[PDB]
């Protein structure tokens, strides 16, 4: 008997482990709604997803819905201030974002739990009466231009758009979703378009209530959340819009049997193989695409990848189904390519078809379905609790595809075995349907076409009928086998009882020469899961460039050889991370703590007795070179950060030094290095989860024992445990290092104001100041001044030292950028004077909320501890300490700080700037006032610069 609600769903199916509460419903205007009650939650969240996206852009205005998406954040009739929304979130511990896919536009935020309504009210207005202010439109068009600019030289985006340009040009699929200055301003002006109209018109046409899903998560009751959503959302007009469909596959007859040869930006070798398939979405309960994805994409013994890897043709493979839109989908198999592989594409593909053929011969396999189903059931039951923001965003999307009651389970639980569908999809994976793309630098200058939006150089060709024929007569090949029963599937899920001496924080339960063990039994999440983290120290992992190279290579070769065996563990929710650090090695094992000791033992055993394959060494090494080389293609702002890291750390080997040194790495040299590296270690570890003190000690000891037994590993001296220091900058000094990015026609800049070592007080000064300037910086440098898409500020922490930093990627030159940040900084101090006492306390409260946000899942908690451990601060209770301290602070305290350490004529200003110039810039010489700046000392040489300066102490361990 409520007119506003069309219906309430029945029980929404949750995992029995899920303590949160749920209600599905549909509003009278047709909006689908999921409500989530979590009385424990620190942040609340909501999301709205409109079932419209760039596929419904007017053909004459590419990127209009992406543009529209940017614009809704910039003011509504009810809250006209350009950044009310942004600011409200900022000063209530929230944040927000949005994205536009071809069929969706998805808007979400989080906020402190007790300001849901405030946030949500402002949020709702996006869908009721956006202003699309005229001067906002003029400015924001640059943000989008910048967004696209950043993607132009990116290889993923180029391939993404190239696929679209090589299908039916008539099809909506072939549209350019991002837009830029040209398509959103320049061209529309020439063509007499009033864009504020087109934005108003499009919003009015498509932002209909019938195409909308809303998820809201908060502490309130389901009844309270119900009234709330009804109140704010039933006034969204139902313009009854038919939901767009795309029955016609964008790849028609003439688009099949085609071969594309593509020149990349980075030096990569890839083979993309694509088949068009119908929309499988409706079969979600049986899911034939997943079954075939699992199989064709398998990596274990007998798998397709396995044979291609053995022939030295490929290193990695992806396969399975790929979204298109309502009405069409793709089935893909993409591999990377060794130098041999490039010359055997025809053979690669024949093996692809031989494997597929094997799947035909053997037919559909219920036990494989059974396994997939059980894994998913286990995954679902024991799923980690999500951060609310991502959770709401995601459910909002799927509300458009699944009955209310199933929204939680529909992407997990499989129900129906369908050999018919498996058969039917399989029948499409045939040589007469194939599209083939080869990406390689060897097509330089051998190409005759250009994709218009990105400038992608490529050539197109009919695959010869004779070749199709060869692929069509693909024999069974004896090296291909279905995978066998997965022995890694966990079966024991008991939660060990909480020991009498479990502690709130990790305890140091072992402190010896060889190893230092931190342990905590999970007292929070109760899932049959564990995290085992190991930091291995050796001075030989980074003693020089050559040694870095070897530490890396060793670890890549190990992973590569372990791959077949570990893949099974991964499907079973048991995975591992293994990489070289500037201190030695890092190992993390994560997942169900049933079969974990097994995988761990296999790993240590392998590293300690490693036997290197000659051919695998050559391939991996070659890849690593290209990898180091390809750095030159990273974004200008990534470059900026890279250089700052190199400038400020005591020891740091450059990519140039690494690639230069990489020629000296021979098979002999590596074999000698491993036992050398392994012969003396210290291990510091975090064991955290569903395990007991006994189990932990045994796990740690088993690791140690395996190393002794096989590598004769003995301890390291306490004095050898060398942590690197941060370079210490001189009062009133200012240095600039400048370099050029040769791929990107944007510039990047990082500005670092070093303050002092970390410590309760210095941390909180920096953190509070960052909180206050956080939103205004974004708002000034981007929204108002439109300096770029990437605009960032906040604390920088490294080697126990800290400071404030700004990162901007922009079309304007770095000296210009410097100027405007400096201007901004004056604004901020002026603003901190003008701001009320409350405004100030609000900011304290926001920081507090952020810092005190409880981890929602095991990994998140481990991460916090691991931060304390690797930084050797071991300040496990730091959050209450630092928040306790924060509340003490006043306007005076922060003004003092800014005056002392940050202001342009600060007594203790310590400033480094990294300038990364655009491809085309050559030299490096109404809006608020920018102060006159000192003569910068231009850093000529990094070694010299470092030798000429003090180094900071290392932080005293808590």
């Amino acid at each position: 008997n409520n007119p506003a609600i069309k219906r309430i769903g029945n029980h929404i199916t949750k995992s029995p482990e899920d303590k949160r509460e749920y209600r599905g419903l549909e509003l009278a205007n047709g909006i689908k709604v999921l409500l989530i009650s979590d009385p424990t939650t620190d942040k609340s969240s909501a999301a709205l997803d409109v079932h419209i996206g760039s596929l419904s852009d007017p053909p004459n205005i590419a990127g209009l819905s992406h543009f529209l998406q940017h614009m809704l954040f910039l003011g509504t009739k009810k809250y006209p201030k350009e950044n009310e929304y942004s600011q409200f979130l900022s000063e209530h511990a929230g944040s927000s974002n949005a994205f536009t896919s071809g069929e969706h536009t998805n808007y979400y935020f989080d906020v402190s739990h007790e300001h849901l309504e405030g946030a949500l009210d402002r949020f709702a207005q996006f869908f009721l009466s956006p202003l699309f202010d005229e001067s906002a439109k003029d400015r924001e068009v640059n943000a989008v231009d910048s967004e696209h600019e950043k993607n132009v030289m990116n290889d993923a985006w180029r391939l993404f758009q190239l696929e679209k340009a090589t299908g039916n040009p008539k099809h909506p699929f072939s549209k350019f979703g991002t837009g830029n200055k040209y398509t959103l301003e320049t061209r529309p002006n020439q063509e007499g378009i009033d864009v504020r109209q087109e934005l108003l018109k499009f919003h009015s046409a498509y932002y209909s209530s019938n195409l909308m899903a809303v998820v809201v998560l908060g502490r309130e009751s389901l009844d309270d959340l119900t009234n709330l959503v009804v109140k704010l959302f039933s006034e969204v007009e139902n313009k009854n819009v038919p939901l767009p469909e795309f029955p016609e596959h964008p790849f028609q007859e003439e688009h099949l049997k085609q071969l594309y040869k593509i020149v990349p930006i980075k030096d990569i070798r890839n083979l993309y193989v694509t088949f068009p398939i119908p929309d499988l979405q409706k079969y979600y309960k049986s899911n034939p695409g997943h079954y075939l994805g699992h199989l064709i994409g398998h990596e274990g013994p007998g798998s397709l990848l396995s044979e291609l890897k053995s022939k030295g043709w490929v290193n990695t493979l992806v396969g399975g189904q790929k979204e298109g839109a309502r009405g069409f989908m793709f089935f893909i198999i993409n591999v990377d390519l060794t130098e041999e592989g490039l010359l055997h594409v025809e053979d690669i593909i024949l093996h692809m078809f031989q494997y597929i053929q094997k799947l035909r011969a053997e037919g559909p396999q219920e036990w494989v379905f059974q396994e997939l189903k059980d894994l998913n059931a286990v995954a679902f039951r024991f799923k980690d609790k999500e951060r609310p923001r991502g959770y709401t965003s995601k459910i909002a999307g799927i509300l458009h595809y699944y009955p209310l009651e199933e929204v939680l389970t529909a992407e997990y639980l499989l129900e129906e075995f369908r050999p018919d569908l498996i058969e039917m999809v399989l029948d499409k994976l045939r040589p007469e349907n194939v599209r083939v793309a080869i990406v390689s630098k060897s097509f330089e200058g051998k190409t005759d076409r250009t994709e218009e939006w990105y400038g992608t150089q490529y050539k197109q060709e009919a695959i010869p009928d004779e070749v199709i024929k060869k692929w069509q007569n693909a024999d069974l090949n004896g090296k291909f086998k279905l995978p066998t029963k997965n022995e890694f599937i966990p079966t024991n899920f008991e939660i060990l009882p909480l020991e009498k001496e479990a502690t709130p924080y990790p305890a140091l339960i072992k402190d010896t020469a060889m190893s230092k063990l931190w342990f905590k039994q999970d007292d929070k999440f109760f899932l049959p899961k564990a995290n085992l983290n190991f930091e291995f120290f050796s001075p030989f992992a980074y003693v020089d460039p050559l040694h870095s190279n070897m530490a890396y290579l060793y670890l890549e070769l190990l992973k590569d050889s372990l791959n077949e065996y570990a893949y099974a563990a991964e499907l079973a929710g048991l995975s591992y991370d293994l990489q070289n650090t500037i201190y030695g090695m890092y190992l993390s094992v994560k997942g169900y703590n049933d079969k974990q000791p097994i995988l761990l033992k296999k790993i240590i055993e392998k590293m300690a007795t490693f036997e290197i394959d000659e051919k695998r060494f050559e391939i991996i090494k070659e890849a690593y070179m290209r990898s180091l080389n390809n750095f030159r293609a990273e974004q200008p702002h990534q470059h900026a950060m890279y250089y700052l890291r190199l400038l400020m750390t005591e020891v740091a080997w450059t990519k140039d030094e690494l690639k230069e040194a990489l020629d000296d790495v021979t098979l002999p040299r590596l074999k000698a290095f491993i036992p050398q590296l392994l012969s003396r270690l210290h291990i510091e570890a975090l064991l955290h989860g569903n395990i007991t003190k006994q189990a932990a000690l045994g796990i740690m000891q088993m690791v140690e024992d395996t190393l002794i037994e096989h590598a004769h590993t003995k301890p390291l001296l306490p004095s050898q445990l060398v942590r690197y220091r941060e370079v210490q900058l001189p009062d009133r000094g200012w240095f600039v290092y400048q370099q050029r990015n040769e791929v990107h026609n944007n510039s990047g800049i990082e500005i670092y104001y070093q303050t002092d070592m970390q410590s309760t007080s210095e941390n909180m000064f920096l953190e509070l100041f960052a909180q206050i300037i956080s939103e205004p910086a974004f708002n000034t440098l981007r929204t108002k001044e439109q300096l770029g898409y990437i605009v960032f500020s906040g604390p920088r922490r490294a080697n126990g030292i800290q400071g404030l930093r700004f990162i901007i990627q922009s079309e304007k030159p770095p000296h210009y950028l410097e100027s405007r940040v400096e201007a901004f900084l004056i604004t901020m101090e002026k603003s901190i004077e003008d701001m009320t006492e409350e405004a100030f306390q609000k900011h304290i409260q926001a920081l507090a909320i952020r810092r005190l946000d409880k981890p929602k899942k095991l990994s998140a908690e481990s991460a916090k501890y691991w931060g304390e451990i690797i930084s050797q601060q071991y300040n496990f209770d730091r959050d209450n300490t630092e928040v306790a301290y924060l509340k003490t602070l006043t306007k005076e305290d922060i003004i003092k700080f800014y005056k002392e350490m940050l202001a342009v004529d600060a007594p203790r200003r310590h400033k480094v700037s990294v300038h990364v110039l655009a491809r085309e810039m050559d030299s490096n010489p109404n809006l608020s006032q920018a102060p006159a700046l000192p003569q910068p000392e231009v850093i000529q040489n990094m070694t010299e610069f470092k030798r000429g300066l003090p180094l900071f102490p290392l932080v005293k361990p808590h």
């Binding site: 994205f99 896919s101 790929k322």
Partner: peptide, 7 residues
């Protein structure tokens, strides 16, 4: 074993 524009 298995795109979109951010704000």
């Amino acid at each position: 074993k298995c795109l979109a524009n951010f704000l």
